[PDB]
Amino acid sequence: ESDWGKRCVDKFDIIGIIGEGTYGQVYKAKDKDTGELVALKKVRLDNEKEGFPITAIREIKILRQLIHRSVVNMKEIVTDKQDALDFKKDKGAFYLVFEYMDHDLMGLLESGLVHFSEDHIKSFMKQLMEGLEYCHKKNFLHRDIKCSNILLNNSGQIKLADFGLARLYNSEESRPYTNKVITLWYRPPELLLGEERYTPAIDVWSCGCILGELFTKKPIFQANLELAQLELISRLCGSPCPAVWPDVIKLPYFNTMKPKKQYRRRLREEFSFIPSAALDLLDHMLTLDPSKRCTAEQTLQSDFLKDVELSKMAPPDLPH
Amino acid sequence: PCWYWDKKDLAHTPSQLEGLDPATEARYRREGARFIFDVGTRLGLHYDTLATGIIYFHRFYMFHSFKQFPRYVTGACCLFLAGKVEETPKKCKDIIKTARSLLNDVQFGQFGDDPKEEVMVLERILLQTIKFDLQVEHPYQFLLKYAKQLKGDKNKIQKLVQMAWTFVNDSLCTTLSLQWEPEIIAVAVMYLAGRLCKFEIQEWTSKPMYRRWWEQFVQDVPVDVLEDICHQILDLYSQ
Ligand SMILES: Cn1cc(-n2cnc3c(NCc4nc5cc(Cl)c(Cl)cc5[nH]4)nc(N4CCOCC4)nc32)cn1
């Protein structure tokens, strides 16, 4: 019950790979003893690269400190192969165990058999920002928010998962952090310009890409490299310039990474089909200047989310 | 999980069962804790990261023997893992370089031909032994929290803290971290520092006549428990 790591992974019956996570693939398994459905993340031990990943240690430390409705709950940790009776030879791995969720947001948007109403988006965005605000209040950055990391059950309950790139941030002091975080399609502009002293505003940007994707059913920034990714962000949110972002000259890659033109902001006209209450939220979440970008607590106070009573939530039906 | 044993259990550790007399194991625990404290200090590591590795060290040899695992190799692995836990990570090559500077070449021989591999390998069974319970609290945060509520002579209170702070450093060499919670150890080092300084700690509290001043910080802690902890700390200076 309390002796984690002792239990062997052969006590689980791996069914199949269900997706690609932070540090490896995600497996779907059934406990051979409890019959419960779980998800497994395999952590590797490089032994020639500081051993057990600190990113895995961060996710273990953080997920054993969080208890919330919209967050994933790590169940236990099991070991791969029993040690050859000289432990100096055992070179296996460990498996983080999680609760299994019925749906992921990536597969729902890709199918086309599902269509989310306005109340469905108001419910999903409410739970996502309530979970992100609780982590920011606890001084934890997700640093990797995408559609495959957002899970959904049949009861309409949203949970945020895959904290493989999470870490603690200093709330009352600036600190240098890791730059190469967040997937390219959801990475904020400041990270594309090489900012290492960023704020929790990087996760709000990714959630801003989720909100716009919930209406278009397609990622809004799809590029194959860092320069082309900054190009697509500039053509919609405007080019990063000191007028919209005075602190942009302090960034290392400001003069290195430059779009073809100095595009204006065409966000409000491109998403005109979006309801007015959601467009005001989308415009504020996709602000170039992270200091002028809204926080997680501010999103819950916006007109699109302040009056969204989560209870009596009606989820869409895509059945057998 | 429960990480606290009795004194009767501390006399029957895996090392005791394999023939090692209690005098030498207590010495290896002191040498191991002194090693982690000296290596991390030279690396400029935060005081919580030092105590975390030492707690990993004491907790390790409650399930494994000193005869199978060298103390300085395990002590190195504890400090390496502790840095990644407390977000103060140090390269393993930097810990080995600091270890070979302090340890004799005979003592450093425990790492074998490949000192880096010997520590990375031990990390697998170290995590299993600690049961992946990485978050560990130390008496420092409670020593500061309790003493900050004390109103009185700013000099006498400051001398009380810097003296109890030294006592917590000395308590890491003993199995006190395996007997009583950090809140209790934090109260105990205050009780000891108040005796040698001839300070009446109860006069700096809301109840100046109530002799058991610590009941506002911890609940249901008799005086004999504090006396037991003070006795084990005073045994370090009698040697
Ligand atoms: C890190 N972490 C993850 C979880 N977690 C729990 N539940 C699921 C889950 N359940 C719906 C689901 N989606 C599926 C897609 C396929 Cl193709 C198949 Cl065959 C079966 C599927 N089932 N999906 C996923 N992934 C979605 C894809 O990208 C990676 C994450 N992660 C999950 C817990 N912690």
Residue numbers in the entry:
A (entry chain A): 716 to 1035
B (entry chain B): 22 to 260
From the article:
In addition to the cell cycle-regulating CDKs, the transcriptional kinases Cdk12 and Cdk13 have become the focus of interest as they mediate a variety of functions, including the transition from transcription initiation to elongation and termination, precursor mRNA splicing, and intronic polyadenylation. Similar to Cdk9, kinases Cdk12 and Cdk13 have been shown to affect the regulation of RNA pol II-mediated transcription elongation through their ability to phosphorylate RNA pol II CTD Ser2 residues. In addition to regulating transcription elongation, Cdk12 directly or indirectly affects several cotranscriptional and posttranscriptional processes, including RNA splicing and processing, and DNA damage response (DDR). The small molecule compound SR-4835 was introduced as a potent and selective reversible inhibitor of Cdk12/Cdk13, leading to deficiencies in DNA damage repair that in combination with DNA-damaging agents and poly-ADP ribose polymerase (PARP) inhibitors result in apoptosis of triple negative breast cancer cells.
We determined the crystal structure of the human Cdk12/CycK heterodimer in complex with small molecule inhibitor SR-4835 at 2.68 Å resolution, indicating a specific interaction of the compound with the kinase N-lobe. SR-4835 occupies the adenine-binding pocket of the kinase with its central purine- and pyrazole-moieties, while the dichloro-benzimidazole moiety of the compound sticks out of the ATP-binding pocket and winds around the first β-strand (β1) of the kinase N-lobe. Hydrogen bonds are formed between the backbone amino and carbonyl groups of M816 in Cdk12 with two nitrogen atoms of the central purine moiety. Here, two H-bonds from the hydroxy groups of residues Y815 and D819 form a clamp to the two nitrogen atoms on either side of the benzimidazole ring. From the top, the two catalytic spine residues V741 and A754 of the N-lobe interact with the central purine and benzimidazole groups, a typical feature of type I kinase inhibitors. Residues of the β1-strand and G-loop I733 and G734 interact intensively via hydrophobic interactions with the benzimidazole and morpholino group of SR-4835, respectively. The αC-helix of Cdk12 is indeed turned in by 23° relative to the Cdk12•ADP•AlF3/CycK structure. This rotational twist is accompanied by a downward shift of the G-loop of more than 5 Å, thus occupying the site that would be captured by the terminal phosphate group of ATP in an active kinase. Similar to Cdk2, the αC-helical turn allows formation of salt bridge interactions between the phosphorylated T-loop residues pT893 and arginines R773, R858, and R882. Of the embedding 815YMDxD interaction motif within the hinge region, the key residue Y815 is replaced by a phenylalanine in Cdk7 and Cdk9, rendering these kinases incapable of forming a hydrogen bond via the side chain hydroxy group with the benzimidazole moiety of the compound.
